[PDB]
Structure formats: structure tokens, C-alpha cells
């Protein structure tokens, strides 16, 4: 009863961070060693759980969130961080119990002339609540004017595109991120190891 992990990690395309994807994992067994024993990952921090213990612990349902950001922003995917990504795109709760996995994906997500399919949110009237997905495309009002659905002076379209090129500096290169969330409600647990 294998859990669909190669689905999440080996997916052809990844989601933009503002429209981050979430896959629920339920009613299956999963080996976490086939993951945390890979040297391919550039980042593997865990919170509220020993990664080694994951093979013998068991949880209600598991959430796998995935998206693309640029390298310098990977540090923002952590409990209690601030910045453009942590505030307007994807925010972790301070009580976060799970693991954050990230690896460079310049060979998949960079394109000659620039891959503009990956977007992030530059402006938002307020900070995101944890695990909130804001896909609003209405125009930001940075001044006092009513933009009437068109962009002008201090009337900004809130989403902006990464220009991922193969020659970008490593800090501006695309990174694929997967966030595993583990919750233990009072409902029966259906995701455990061997």
C-alpha cells in the first residue's frame, strides 16, 4: 500500500508559490528513508519530529505542499519567518510539525530566454494566515485612487513572474519545495511506516 510520493517529488511541472498545490496523503504506508537518505536535496529541516522516528510513528493524514521559489527565498519556508514569500505567498505556523524539503531545479524550470510561467505575489493588503492560498488577481491599490480594473499610477497588478534563465545566479535559480505536514487529530490514523 505505497503512498504517492513520487507523484509529488517527480511531477513534471510544479505550482507557482502563490497558487501552491496541496496533496492529501491518506490510507497507505510510506517509507521515509527512501527520502531522507537522498543527497539530492539541498535543504531538509524537520520540526516537532525526528526524521528517523518517522518510520515508526503514524499520523492521521499527511499534507504535501509543493511549489517553486528562487534559491535565496528558501530560508523563508520555516516557522516564524518574514519576507515577501513568507508574508504574501506561503506561511508556516509557529507550531509547525513537519519537514521542509528543497532542491535546485535549474535544469527543469529554467528556459532559454526566460521561463515566466512561475509567479509570486509582490503586494497584499495584509499578511497571510498560515496555510492560506491567495489566488486573487484583482489590482492592488497602493494609493488613494480607484483603479477600475486597470493598472496605472500606484495601481499595480499584484502578481509578478520569475525570469528563470539557465545563466541566473544560483540565488535567483528555481528551487522546488515540498512541505510535509503531520497532524494527529482524534480521528483514526491511516498513514504510518513499515
Amino acid at each position, epitope marked *: 500500500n505505497l503512498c504517492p510520493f513520487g507523484e509529488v517529488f517527480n511531477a513534471t511541472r510544479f505550482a507557482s508559490v502563490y497558487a501552491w498545490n496541496r496533496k492529501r496523503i491518506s490510507n497507505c504506508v510510506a517509507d521515509y528513508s527512501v527520502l531522507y537518505n537522498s543527497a539530492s536535496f539541498s535543504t531538509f529541516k524537520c520540526y516537532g519530529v525526528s526524521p528517523t522516528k518517522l518510520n515508526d510513528l503514524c499520523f492521521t493524514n499527511v499534507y504535501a505542499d509543493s511549489f517553486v521559489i528562487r534559491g535565496d527565498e528558501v530560508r523563508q519556508i520555516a516557522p516564524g519567518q518574514t519576507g515577501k514569500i513568507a508574508d504574501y505567498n506561503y506561511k508556516l505556523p509557529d507550531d509547525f510539525t513537519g519537514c521542509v524539503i528543497a532542491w535546485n531545479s535549474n*535544469n527543469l524550470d529554467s528556459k532559454v530566454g526566460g521561463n515566466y510561467n512561475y509567479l509570486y505575489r509582490l503586494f497584499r493588503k495584509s499578511n497571510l494566515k498560515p496555510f492560506e492560498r491567495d489566488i486573487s488577481t484583482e489590482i492592488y491599490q497602493a494609493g488613494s485612487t480607484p483603479c477600475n480594473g486597470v493598472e496605472g499610477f500606484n495601481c499595480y497588478f499584484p502578481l509578478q513572474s520569475y525570469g528563470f534563465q539557465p*545563466t541566473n*545566479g*544560483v540565488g*535567483y535559480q528555481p528551487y522546488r519545495v515540498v512541505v510535509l505536514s503531520f497532524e494527529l487529530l482524534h480521528a483514526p490514523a491511516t498513514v504510518c511506516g513499515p
Partner: antibody
Amino acid sequence: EVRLVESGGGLVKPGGSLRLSCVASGFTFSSYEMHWVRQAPGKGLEWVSVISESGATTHYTDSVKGRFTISRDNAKNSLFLQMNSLRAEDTAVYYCTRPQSVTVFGVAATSYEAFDFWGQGLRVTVSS
Amino acid sequence: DIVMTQSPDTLSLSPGETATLSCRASQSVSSYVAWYQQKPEQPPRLLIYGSSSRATGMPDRFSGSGSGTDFTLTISSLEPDDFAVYYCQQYTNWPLTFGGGTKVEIKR
């Protein structure tokens, strides 16, 4: 003039550790991502490590991941390679390397193509 | 990891002739290839980037061509200074990889 003065190499026993330092001058150090490349005796060139301008992003070749750590102090124009649990195959001449910027005008993301400047090299000998 | 195979290992030529050095990649790297010269006890010197673009101050007898997986460095009218080791490098796929090198030796 662009200059990269290197220091901190030399002799070590297997399982030992070193810290290579590279002080930059003649250019804006904080605007450049920086690399370490190495060359074993009689062998060719092997890329080792890269760090972004801010230092928030680092990347390593697989044979040194988890043992080597690249870092930088932009206030002191300094680049460092910390080498732990050194192995015999880590013996080489080590170069700090500045890649060539091709960032056009005022785009936010930097772009680089090849290595346009190299330090003189530090000998690192790991032997019993 | 992309392997950069240089060929041949040695060319034996005299001054005034033309050196043609080949580099082949195990998969496509578009035009993201560079060529360096190395002399004994010195760091490498960048000669060509972007497959065909000369570094600042390179003589025009150095020229580069190719794309995808096939790349060539041509040194026209070899001078006594040009007899050295030459490396190709791809610089967009991690880890960055260099070719094994080609030595241009004096013919006799």
C-alpha cells in the same frame, strides 16, 4: 585592480580539517556570487562550491556535500571554504573564482557566464 | 552530471598552423560552454564564453563555435605562446563540469 588573495591551506591528516580564506579587492564583492574550484595533481579541474551574493543560497558537488561549507563575510570582502573530515582525494590546488557577470542594466536577477577571474591557488595536501 | 569529453588528448603542431580542439557533451547544454587556457603553475585563463563570444582582450585568432552537444575551439596562426593546455566547461547544469583537457605540443 581585481585581486583575490588566498590563505589557509597546507598539510592535514585524513580526518583533519582546514579553513581556506580568500580576500577580494578591486571590485564590489557583495554583488558577485562566488565559487571554489579545485585541481588535483596531474588531473583536470573540478568544480566544488558556489555561494550567492547574499550568502542565502549555497550549492556543492556531491563528493563534498555535508563535509564542506562555503560562506562569506561581505563586510570584510571575504570568502571561506571550511573542510571537515578531509580525505586523501581532497588533495588539490584550490582556487576561489569570480564568475563573469552579464547582468544587463537594472534587472533584478543577476546572470553569469563562465569564470572571468581566478586566484593564484592554495595547495591542500591530505596525507598520512 | 554532464560529461565533457575533449578530443584528442594531444595535438602536435608548429607555429603558424591551425589547432582544432573538440569538446562533446553527454547531453545538450545549448551555447553555455566556455574555453580556458592553462599554463604550468598558473590558474586557468578564460578565452571563450557563450560557445562563440571572446573574452575581453582575446586575440581574434581564438574562435569558438558549436551548440547542443558539439563544440570547437579554433586557434588560427599558432604563436609560441599558444602551446598550453585547453579546457572546455559547461556552466549551467549542476555540477559544473570541465573537460579532461587537450595539450597543444610543438611538432618536431
